[PDB]
Design a protein around this ligand. Sequence first.
Ligand SMILES: Nc1ncnc2c1ncn2[C@@H]1O[C@H](COP(=O)(O)OP(=O)(O)NP(=O)(O)O)[C@@H](O)[C@H]1O
Ligand SMILES: Nc1ncnc2c1ncn2[C@@H]1O[C@H](COP(=O)(O)OP(=O)(O)NP(=O)(O)O)[C@@H](O)[C@H]1O
Ligand SMILES: O=C(O)[C@@H](Cl)Cc1ccccc1
Ligand SMILES: O=C(O)[C@@H](Cl)Cc1ccccc1
Ligand SMILES: [K+]
Ligand SMILES: [K+]
Ligand SMILES: [Mg+2]
Ligand SMILES: [Mg+2]
Lengths: 307, 307
Amino acid sequence: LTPTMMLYSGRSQDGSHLLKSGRYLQQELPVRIAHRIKGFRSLPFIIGCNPTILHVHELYIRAFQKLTDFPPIKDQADEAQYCQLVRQLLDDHKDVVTLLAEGLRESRKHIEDEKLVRYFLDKTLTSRLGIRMLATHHLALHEDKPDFVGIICTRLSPKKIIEKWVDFARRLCEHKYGNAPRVRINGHVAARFPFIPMPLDYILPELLKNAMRATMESHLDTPYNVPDVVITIANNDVDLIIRISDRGGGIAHKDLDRVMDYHFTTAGFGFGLPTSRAYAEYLGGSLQLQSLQGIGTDVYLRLRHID
Amino acid sequence: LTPTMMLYSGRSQDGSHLLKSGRYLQQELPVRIAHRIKGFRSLPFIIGCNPTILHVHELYIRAFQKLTDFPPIKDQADEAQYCQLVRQLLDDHKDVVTLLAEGLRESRKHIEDEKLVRYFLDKTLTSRLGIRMLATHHLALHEDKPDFVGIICTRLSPKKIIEKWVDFARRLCEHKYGNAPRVRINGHVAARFPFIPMPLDYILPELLKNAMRATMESHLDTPYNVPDVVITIANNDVDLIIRISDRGGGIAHKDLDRVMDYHFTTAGFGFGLPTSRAYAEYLGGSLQLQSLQGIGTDVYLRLRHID
Ligand SMILES: Nc1ncnc2c1ncn2[C@@H]1O[C@H](COP(=O)(O)OP(=O)(O)NP(=O)(O)O)[C@@H](O)[C@H]1O
Ligand SMILES: Nc1ncnc2c1ncn2[C@@H]1O[C@H](COP(=O)(O)OP(=O)(O)NP(=O)(O)O)[C@@H](O)[C@H]1O
Ligand SMILES: O=C(O)[C@@H](Cl)Cc1ccccc1
Ligand SMILES: O=C(O)[C@@H](Cl)Cc1ccccc1
Ligand SMILES: [K+]
Ligand SMILES: [K+]
Ligand SMILES: [Mg+2]
Ligand SMILES: [Mg+2]
């Protein structure tokens, strides 16, 4: 399970579990989308009038209409068509973070309660993650993948998923700078346990891109020889901790109280850190920074295990 | 300068700076000791009645009496005798932390506001540190040491002072376990800057003893081969950061919210962490912990530079 939301682990050769899951989504999705729409309705007028914000507001209204127009699921044929709707919505909404980032960029500067936008984005993006997790889990229940129950991996290796995003981040970095730091991984490198990959897929590349950028920009004279990024995995009975340590110079004292703000960037829209922290906390984890100004930064991602 | 307190850097071949410093102490010390006595008077009755607490309470009353009985300093002869008094008090009060630790151990368990004892100890021990710093600075103004203005070092090497306490902590550890982790020091190893050693002399051995203990107790099967403790020095224009990282297994989740409490220990009286944090914060710095349960702990000491 996740916040106020359960990921069904059920199984059935008759397929009765798919119907129960689908009926659950049918009950749950319209209510959560309605909460998002209320979020839009309460946005400060001048922000809500932004055409890009209006577009996203309308997307959610359409989603609500489609979800509520769909008849109650009674058989596999109904459930099958519901999945088509769910797939369409997942796709129609895939650029929502980007659209909100852009819609909010300028319009936020008007109102003076800066807490409002942070609150709306935390609430909106985490609810969205939860919705996409539930929806994707349902679809995945149809899949035949070993080591997976829906989107839940029954034996996830933290080292493997980290290496996947390391390779991705390294490619982006090389394309921009001509090279990328090597990454070393230490600690509980052989750990395997049940876990939902999706949050890691969102968070890890954000933290890795940050570490690599900082490392390259502080070693412009020696791009062919930069300090490794060092990742430590700690696996205990309560949580999984992933520490990502770089020698990229640290986060400056003058920037320290701003790096967690949406739209703050020293370079994207400056979303990597605030979104990653909102997601971690939404799931009962946390994201903490330790800056060693002049040396580097340690970032600690903590995510709870599955009970 | 330090909190509401200035360490005089003055100089004079006539020695007029010693008189000005001494008169400053004469003004300042009785007032601060009076505040400590008020602290004792406000302690919960049942704690204040403890014979060891009463003994310390009386020590401070005697100090106040001696300080206020001393006539106004007018010449070098007066100043010279005042230093004798200051030396006597520094010596008479050298075991105060220990006496308070013991006096408070049981008696604190009676009252239910646990915040009270923490507050009294933070306030009492930091004020005491400040007093001992001011007093020792004054005495040291008579000394002829190169690279020192009183207790202020004009070119302190963080690496050197760390190595001094490493050797000390390693000896204690070897005596208890038969071996000690090696310590590596990296980062700004060649840094030198004006700094007051005294807080580092209090804090560093406390953090090093913790790291070494944890390392030895988690490697009982291989005491002859344990993970190094790794210390990173970061020196910037705002602060000095010293990170002490061990592979001693971490601080358990169940203990995490208690390790900063006076008297909490899994083994002294459990004072190393709460005192070290109070001292750091008293000076405008901080002490932060990052636990990787199952792996180790990172401890970050931050102390502000001298303006
Ligand atoms: N490991 C790091 N070292 C140094 N600076 C960092 C580090 N991580 C983040 N920062 C700084 O923190 C700022 C904000 O980070 P972030 O929220 O991820 O947005 P961004 O990287 O600038 N753009 P985005 O692609 O949206 O994530 C960065 O722009 C940097 O100035
Ligand atoms: N680096 C560490 N790794 C694991 N546990 C630690 C570490 N540092 C502190 N602790 C734990 O934190 C507790 C409290 O620390 P502390 O305040 O320094 O008191 P103490 O070491 O037990 N006794 P004292 O000699 O008075 O300092 C310890 O007893 C340990 O259980
Ligand atoms: O904004 C999104 O990505 C989500 Cl909330 C769109 C969606 C709604 C309902 C079901 C699946 C996806
Ligand atoms: O408790 C202490 O160590 C200090 Cl406050 C005693 C003292 C008082 C005054 C001057 C010097 C030392
Ligand atoms: K940001
Ligand atoms: K303690
Ligand atoms: Mg980023
Ligand atoms: Mg200790």
